[PDB]
Amino acid sequence: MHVKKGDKVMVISGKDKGKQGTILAAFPKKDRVLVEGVNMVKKHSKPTQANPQGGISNQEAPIHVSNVMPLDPKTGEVTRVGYKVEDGKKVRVAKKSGQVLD
């Protein structure tokens, strides 16, 4: 995927359009990611052995990976992603500036 766990991204599509957050988890198999503070859901959980209160709980639900873009290091605007090789090691680059993301 063009983003990965730990990347700062901007949500470019959905109810959370224009909201930035960190990727808390990636789901390559589903092409979804979990972004902090984005796409919150109210899960109605019964009492279990783990959580014996139960209750309604606000948690992030994952969004499609194509609805987030990484931010340009220089300008702080969304960027498409390229790849160059530095020190015999491939790195992502912000196509907007040229700056390395990671």
Partner RNA sequence: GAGCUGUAAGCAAGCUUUGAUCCGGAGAUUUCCGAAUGGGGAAACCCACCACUCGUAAUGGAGUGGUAUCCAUAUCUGAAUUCAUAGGAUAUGAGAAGGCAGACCCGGGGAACUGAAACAUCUAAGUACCCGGAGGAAGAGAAAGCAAAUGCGAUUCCCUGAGUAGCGGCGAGCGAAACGGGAUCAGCCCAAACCAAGAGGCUUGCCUCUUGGGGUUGUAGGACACUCGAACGAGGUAGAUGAAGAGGUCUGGAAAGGCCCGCCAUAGGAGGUAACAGCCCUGUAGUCAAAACUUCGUUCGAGUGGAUCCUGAGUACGGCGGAACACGUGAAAUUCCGUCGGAAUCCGGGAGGACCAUCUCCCAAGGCUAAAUACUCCCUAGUGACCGAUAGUGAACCAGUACCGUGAGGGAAAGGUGAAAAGCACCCCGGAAGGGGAGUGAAAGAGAUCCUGAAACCGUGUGC
Partner RNA sequence: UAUGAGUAGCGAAAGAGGGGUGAGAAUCCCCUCCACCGAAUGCCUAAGGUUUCCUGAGGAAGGCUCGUCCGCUCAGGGUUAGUCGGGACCUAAGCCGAGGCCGAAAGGCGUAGGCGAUGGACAACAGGUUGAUAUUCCUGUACCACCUCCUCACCAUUUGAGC
Partner RNA sequence: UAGCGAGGUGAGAGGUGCCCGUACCGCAAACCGACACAGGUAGGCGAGGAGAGAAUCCUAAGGUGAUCGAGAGAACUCUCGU
Residues in contact with RNA by the rule CB under 7 A: 1-2, 4-5, 10, 12-18, 23, 25-29, 31, 39, 41-48, 50, 54-56, 61-67, 69, 77-78, 80-84, 89-90, 93, 95-96
Does 14 interact with K ion (rule: CB under 5 A)? no
> For residue 78, what is the DSSP state?
B
Please name the residues in contact with 10: beta carbons below 8 A apart, sequence gap of 6 or more: 18, 19, 20, 68, 69, 70, 71, 78
Report d(CA 13, CA 23) in Å as an integer. 16
Whole-number minimum distance, CB 101 to RNA, in Å?
Answer: 10
Only segment of 38-46, 50-58, 63-71, 88-96 that touches K ion (CB under 5 A): 63-71
Select from 14, 22, 66, 73 the one that contacts K ion (CB under 5 A): 66
33 and 1 in contact (C-beta within 8 Å)?
yes
